[PDB]
Amino acid sequence: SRKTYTLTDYLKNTYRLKLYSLRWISDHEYLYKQENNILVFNAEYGNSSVFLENSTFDEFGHSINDYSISPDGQFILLEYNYVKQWRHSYTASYDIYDLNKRQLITEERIPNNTQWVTWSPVGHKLAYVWNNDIYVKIEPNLPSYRITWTGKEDIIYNGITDWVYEEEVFSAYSALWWSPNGTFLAYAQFNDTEVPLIEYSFYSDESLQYPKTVRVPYPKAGAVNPTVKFFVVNTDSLSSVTNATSIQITAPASMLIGDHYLCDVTWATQERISLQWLRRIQNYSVMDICDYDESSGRWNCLVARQHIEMSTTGWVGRFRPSEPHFTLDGNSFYKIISNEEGYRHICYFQIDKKDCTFITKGTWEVIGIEALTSDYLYYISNEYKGMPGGRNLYKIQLSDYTKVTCLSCELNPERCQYYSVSFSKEAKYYQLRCSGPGLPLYTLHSSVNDKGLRVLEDNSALDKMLQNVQMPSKKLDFIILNETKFWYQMILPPHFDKSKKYPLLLDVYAGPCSQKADTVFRLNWATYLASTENIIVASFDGRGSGYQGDKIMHAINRRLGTFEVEDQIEAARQFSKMGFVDNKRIAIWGWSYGGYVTSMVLGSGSGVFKCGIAVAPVSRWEYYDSVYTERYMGLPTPEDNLDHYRNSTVMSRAENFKQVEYLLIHGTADDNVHFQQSAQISKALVDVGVDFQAMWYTDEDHGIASSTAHQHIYTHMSHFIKQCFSLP
Amino acid sequence: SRKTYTLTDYLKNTYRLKLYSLRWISDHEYLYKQENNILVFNAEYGNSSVFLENSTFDEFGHSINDYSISPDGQFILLEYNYVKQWRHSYTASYDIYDLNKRQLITEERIPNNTQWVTWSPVGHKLAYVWNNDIYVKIEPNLPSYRITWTGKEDIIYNGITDWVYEEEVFSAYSALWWSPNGTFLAYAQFNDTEVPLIEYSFYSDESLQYPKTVRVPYPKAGAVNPTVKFFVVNTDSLSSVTNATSIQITAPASMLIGDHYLCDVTWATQERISLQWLRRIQNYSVMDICDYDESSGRWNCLVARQHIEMSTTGWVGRFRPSEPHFTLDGNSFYKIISNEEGYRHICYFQIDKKDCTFITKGTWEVIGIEALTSDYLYYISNEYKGMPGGRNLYKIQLSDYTKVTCLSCELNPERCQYYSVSFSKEAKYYQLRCSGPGLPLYTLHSSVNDKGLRVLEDNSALDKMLQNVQMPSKKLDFIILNETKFWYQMILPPHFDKSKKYPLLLDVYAGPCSQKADTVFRLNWATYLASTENIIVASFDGRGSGYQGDKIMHAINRRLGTFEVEDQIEAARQFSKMGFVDNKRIAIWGWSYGGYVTSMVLGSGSGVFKCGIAVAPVSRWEYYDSVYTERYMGLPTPEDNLDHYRNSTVMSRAENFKQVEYLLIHGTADDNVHFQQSAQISKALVDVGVDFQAMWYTDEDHGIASSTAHQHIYTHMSHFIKQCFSLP
Ligand SMILES: COc1cc2c(cc1OC)[C@@H]1C[C@H](N)[C@@H](c3cccc(CF)c3)CN1CC2
Ligand SMILES: COc1cc2c(cc1OC)[C@@H]1C[C@H](N)[C@@H](c3cccc(CF)c3)CN1CC2
């Protein structure tokens, strides 16, 4: 008799999850936004002052998009005129408000259309990139020093990443790294000179008489890649009428032999930088440790302290080689490395030494190292109750590795099984963040004894509202295939009845190192399909999926669109053999890799599925970018992996599609997985005479996420599934 | 008759209409291809010979796409390596084969990738266009003479047409015109330097890693048009030492004022040429008559013989100024003109004299003038039975205009109401060819006493098959709207029953000077929908339709998307009132102009239609080309017609679509109505929250004509209509 969770609810965001986003500023204080004021909180004691009043910048004259405060709290960056580029990149204008004053600084502004800006870690230095060149401001009201002069649109990138690096390597537009002193500005430089361009139409507003052609350097599988150089400049010795001296750091000779990438830049100390490089064949990676020479003003990367990481079974790292966390003195670090068994654990490295010591071990994985002090290392793992889909915060005594405390496990075991954390400087305090399976809970904790201090946000407003709606529930369990556990989740309709036969939607991503079965609380489309349409929405984590060792994750190595595909079919077959699913009403849908697999399934002939929706699918690996594809597939050459590059296309299975109802969707402005991918799927389905359904989305990219397109695609998909399942 | 006409029947060409394609080669002889041999028939004696054996080119080694026999039957052109460009343009390889000797010409072969070749109308000279330049060959085995040197890809076109001229002016790739002598080669030269480029992606075979960007000079409404220059070259005076002196004929001073077009090129005598020119505001045109000046070498156009053709109510001509037909001596001509009551009749022009004399009159129009002799002019009109959708050959005595004989009206009055004709060189014999309402009937005649000579193909084979098929029947009637007659046709299901209530698909095109209500016999998609699905397919010829005089055609002037839309709604509203129509099941669909009108109807909020289909619709006139658009719309400037350009978009009506079910389809390589047009529609619909269906056809142009795409689109549209009308 209660109201149901409707498509409108989802779409108009009727029930919002509350968050508590803070930024640690010291060892003991953080910044937080309350009713549009910026507040400072004291962690120990809970009291707050107003840092920046809401009503300041009422007469500023521009809508303010973000803020950024100098480490040494004298200035604030006001970001405005944000215009998005790709996933991380954007262009904006900037002003500086001088805080120890009433005033915006008016001389020597950061240019309009700046590509990236950063404060140094200490004081108030600024580094920014504008027109692909680096600049440095020692003082907010003084002129900038030009660090680089080679910048050119689409060709040379100084201190920002190009398209593949943004997307596939740094997950960041920025390629600037200040030393912890603020003394040295390290930076990468990318050269896209010979990198082929993907081109596509942008239609824009009606008034645009002629369509624009967007041209983006984008190395497809096997094409010419960008090249990299690394540089470190001394920020303390810049001259106004002498050009700045950038000292280059050369990649290791074992990388310079052929094509390679920069992977990681981590400062170790005031005079030591850590650099990881990875070979185009993502088999082999090297970490270089480089010290600054006070004599020659040069950097020296002693071959003696180089570190190597290879994999016999797949590629290095989860998506890239993991980052090292150095001890205060910089002579040793910790790093997540896959062990002999295939499980990702914490290894202790010493700088001038050759092997590493494993600090954790077991039939589970460390997800990330979050903090390091002289006494403990803090990490997040899925160790608790052997649930790969859970996440908890642990703590190790470094005096003794066997002495391990779980810090979040027993806090709220029913509500809370999916943590992430955020420590203050030197880890005096941490904010725990519970993500499910109950409602998100945010707490603040004190490290000295691990005593809880304060609940920060408990989403009790949402709980009150949710009591009045017929919410679905979540099953998280596993099946056994050829003697191995493989988890799935089920979003079950309210008042579920095990004797009744429900329609089932298989929700797939299934890309490498993915996890679709976890313990987080979500309000999404699947919430609606269960609460209102009584549809079971199922996800399954099969071979190739992450966080359960390399035996599972790498199964897929050099062979995408293979085991991950068969295994979604099997999960389906098996969900079928439980008594509460109507085996005449099983759909499948996914987005991105999700659309590829959905497409490869629908094209398998299993006869298991009635219909499926693919949104923005990869159709052929030679269409996707090089860093991603080659990481799992090698090069598409007859001496490497051409053969399976060809066997694993959506196109090759066109015939089989006559057995199923197919909905194909793609935004026309997809820089990521180009419209071409769906273009070739539809053309091949046409060539064979297979009817299917389509929908392009003008000027939308990979997220199809503009407000109206978001509502449209979900409405469209709701109809298609409702009609596939014969639901009113 | 048990078996029904299937969607498969239309798609697979189960019921072939036979045709009879001859090419006259003198006054008394013609060539015909029967199976794969070339046969010459005698028209006087009926007897025949084999000209060219089918097996003649067995060991040639290229699949021949076409032949062209020279006027003196000495040589044959062989066309292979055919690649289509636009509607008329294409590139090909050519050989010449000496017929007298039985040899291949090896020396000085016409180059690969030729854009156009043509014999002279007499003898065996060749003019061809390669890489945008004109070449001439006196002897098929001799070095060619380079006429022009200025030709540059997408910029300068010598003797061929750019995109707009091809599609909207000459309906040809060719821009060459030999004098009847074979002495003179005249050619136009087009300048696209400043014409903006339409840019779209082409995806090609799967194997193409990166999509290609096709770039085409295409002036949209209001943009910078190409420029035109006209030249004449003396073929007889060419030197292999010196260069070719081309002599320029420039436009009239009344043209050179602003933007203009070279409208028409019609030779008069061996030494006289007629040119028409059209102003950019296409309501003013001018005919220039130009004589060769024996001794000086130039060409001269006396302003005395200049003839003005303008319009007060619309544009000049049907799609252009009509073509002149000269009498042997070349001092006079006949040409169709709108008369003081707005109907299109033949006029007698004497070269030096003011006005012209009308030789035909009445409330019908002459469709075309087909031949001229000393004593008679033959023409085609829709006079018979006061019927605009009919077409009949007539005869007019020149020494007495009141002696009008209908050569065809009575020949087969129930089977044939729609003829076209093909006279011999000097009109001694003509092949009539009728297209309906019954099956196509091809008959030869002698002009002398208009004696019926022979039956050439009568489609008897097809006739028997069809008795075995539950054929639909065509009803071609009219309705009185204001106090005017607007014609409609109706395709009716077999065993039609005037008391049962049928679903109706309103078939629409309705572009200016269109006619969808006629007496043609068609085996098409409307045939299958009526035969198999018992849907009525109606079409209506409302305001803007042609062949009924300017009072109807020009109603739409400076005003597209208004009257021609309101009238289609009206039509269906009337069709509703007729008791055989189920008024909850009316659909509309259309291609090109049709798609725009369908969309505008669907967006009108009339309440009459349940669903529509729109294929490659125009959506906004600023997106379609200048030549066609400004003809009907004027310029998109505030001081001309910008307001109505803006009041007539599909986009602005978007809200209204929540009321109907919309299927919108477009090919991504449509160089004509650019994909852009639907892209902007889709985006409007998304912006306003309206669901609809969509389908793109990748790499298909405006016709969506490739056999797999063609079969695909009608299959897809079938299901759509079937489901809209609740039919299994
Ligand atoms: C922890 O870090 C990372 C996580 C993740 C990504 C990258 C990451 O770091 C580079 C990649 C980036 C990649 N571009 C994404 C994508 C988008 C479109 C199409 C495909 C292929 F199907 C893949 C998939 N994700 C998975 C999640
Ligand atoms: C007897 O001659 C001619 C007839 C006709 C045409 C041209 C003709 O010759 C110039 C025009 C050419 C025009 N380009 C076509 C078209 C194509 C796409 C979009 C639109 C606008 F909606 C219009 C329609 N047709 C109608 C039939």
Ligand SMILES: *[C@@H]1O[C@H](CO)[C@@H](O)[C@H](O)[C@H]1NC(C)=O
């Ligand atoms: C980038 O690389 C190209 C060769 O691909 C080279 O010619 C050019 O000098 C390089 N530019 C810079 C500034 O490194």
Ligand SMILES: *[C@@H]1O[C@H](CO)[C@@H](O)[C@H](O)[C@H]1NC(C)=O
């Ligand atoms: C018709 O036959 C006659 C009689 O032999 C011959 O002169 C002539 O070539 C023939 N015409 C054709 C076109 O075959």
